[PDB]
């Protein structure tokens, strides 16, 4: 993820140990007039943090910087994944919002299925019989 983020930012192909130093110099040292805001989506954040939890800290700590213009939308499965991996004092220092999506009710499933059938339900087709 360090390689692919720094490649999308800069167009440069570096190794991962050179990409996180490239990103960390990018977010805290480079001025706000020279950069562009970056909205990165860390999708399925469970899979990145299973072995060493060094990867969830860096993306969240980069957002605490003043010069950084970084919005990490971190979508995962469980709600306690920040507090188990990082700890209590780190997840209070970052100060991120915390949304949970409850699974849909049965009346919400009906307004998904019948919403994808508005152009075809109760409608007329031309079928040839051969």
């Amino acid at each position: 993820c360090y390689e692919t983020l720094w490649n999308k930012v800069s167009g440069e192909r570096l190794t991962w140990a050179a990409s996180m130093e490239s990103l960390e110099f990018y977010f805290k040292r480079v001025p706000k007039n020279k950069k562009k805001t970056i909205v990165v989506l860390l999708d399925e954040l469970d899979a990145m943090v299973t072995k060493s939890q060094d990867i969830m800290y860096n993306f969240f700590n980069w957002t605490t910087y003043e010069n950084a213009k970084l919005i990490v939308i971190a979508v995962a499965n469980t709600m306690d994944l920040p507090e188990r991996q990082l700890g209590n004092k780190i997840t209070s220092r970052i100060g991120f919002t915390r949304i949970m999506f409850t699974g849909y009710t049965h009346e919400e499933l009906k307004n998904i299925i019948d919403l994808r059938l508005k152009g075809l339900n109760d409608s007329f087709f031309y079928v040839d019989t051969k």
Partner: protein
């Protein structure tokens, strides 16, 4: 060419380093005619005494010819195979003592192992280095067979002096009368924290608390598992943790106050299979939370 073992009841430590430093080392140097012989002394009552770090020290003093490719025999042991190259080198050198290795408590907890004794026996064959050793345990001669007693060829001396052993009773808790498991090394770490800098204790407290987060996460187990590389903090993430709490100003001042824990083996630095440089504390989880409360959290 005799190695020289001292046994008896009482501490032999103040005897051994007064004989080897004050008497022995100036008088070999005068008899070889300027500087004295280097006297590598070796605290074997320390349960963290590693044989690869001792052999790292000896090759800095002798500077031997390191081991060619035909001599490294398909995952051969480079520590043993370089001593055997060193014996064949020093069988033709002039008979001059140029190192005095002084082993306190040759039957101590980490040094009574078979790989340590095999190192020191083959190293005792070299007549250019003089072994001065000591033993406390009463079944200590059970530790050398006919091959190791040949390479050592000790002459034994009884020095009973009824000394207290107040330095040997530091790596091992005396309030518990000796059931402190003797091989932890964390009780001897408790003594080291008591006289440090407050900025060096705030770092080590931060290192303990962050690894204590990783042991309770990864193990999912109350029982005593001793902390290894998986639970350790990596070094570049640790620099961000101690810059927010104002311990270290940069990477170099962090590495300068880490290495004082590395030389005492209270913290280890090694790299994983990706290049992450992990820093980790070699103690169990129960010894890590006891140490956090008794010396570190009083501020």
């Amino acid at each position: 060419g005799f190695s020289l073992l001292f046994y008896g009841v009482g501490s032999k430590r103040n005897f051994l380093e007064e004989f080897a430093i004050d008497y022995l080392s100036p008088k070999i140097a005068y008899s070889q005619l300027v500087n004295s012989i280097p006297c590598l002394i070796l605290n074997g009552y320390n349960p963290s005494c590693n044989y690869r770090d001792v052999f790292k020290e000896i090759t800095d003093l002798l500077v031997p010819a390191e081991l060619t490719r035909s001599e490294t025999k398909y995952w051969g042991n480079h520590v043993i195979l370089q001593i055997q190259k060193m014996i064949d080198f020093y069988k033709n050198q002039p008979l001059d003592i140029k190192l005095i290795l002084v082993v306190h408590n040759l039957d101590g907890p980490s040094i009574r192992k078979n790989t340590f004794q095999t190192m020191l026996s083959f190293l005792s064959v070299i007549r250019q280095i003089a072994i001065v050793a000591s033993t406390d345990h009463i079944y200590a001669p059970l530790l050398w067979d006919n091959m190791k007693a040949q390479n050592y060829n000790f002459v034994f001396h009884d020095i009973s002096n009824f000394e207290p052993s107040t330095v040997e009773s530091t790596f091992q808790d005396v309030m518990k009368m000796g059931k402190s498991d003797t091989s932890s090394g964390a009780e001897g770490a408790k003594y080291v924290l008591q006289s440090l800098t407050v900025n060096s204790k705030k770092m080590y407290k931060l290192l303990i608390e962050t690894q204590m987060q990783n042991m309770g996460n990864l193990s999912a187990n109350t029982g005593p598992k001793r902390g290894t590389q998986r639970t350790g903090v990596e070094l570049k993430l640790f620099n961000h943790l101690c810059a927010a709490d104002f311990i270290a100003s940069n990477e170099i001042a962090l590495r300068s106050m880490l290495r004082e824990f590395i030389e005492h083996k209270m913290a280890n630095i090694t790299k994983n299979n990706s290049g992450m440089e992990i820093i980790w504390v070699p103690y169990t989880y129960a010894e890590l939370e006891k140490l956090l409360k008794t010396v570190l959290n009083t501020l």
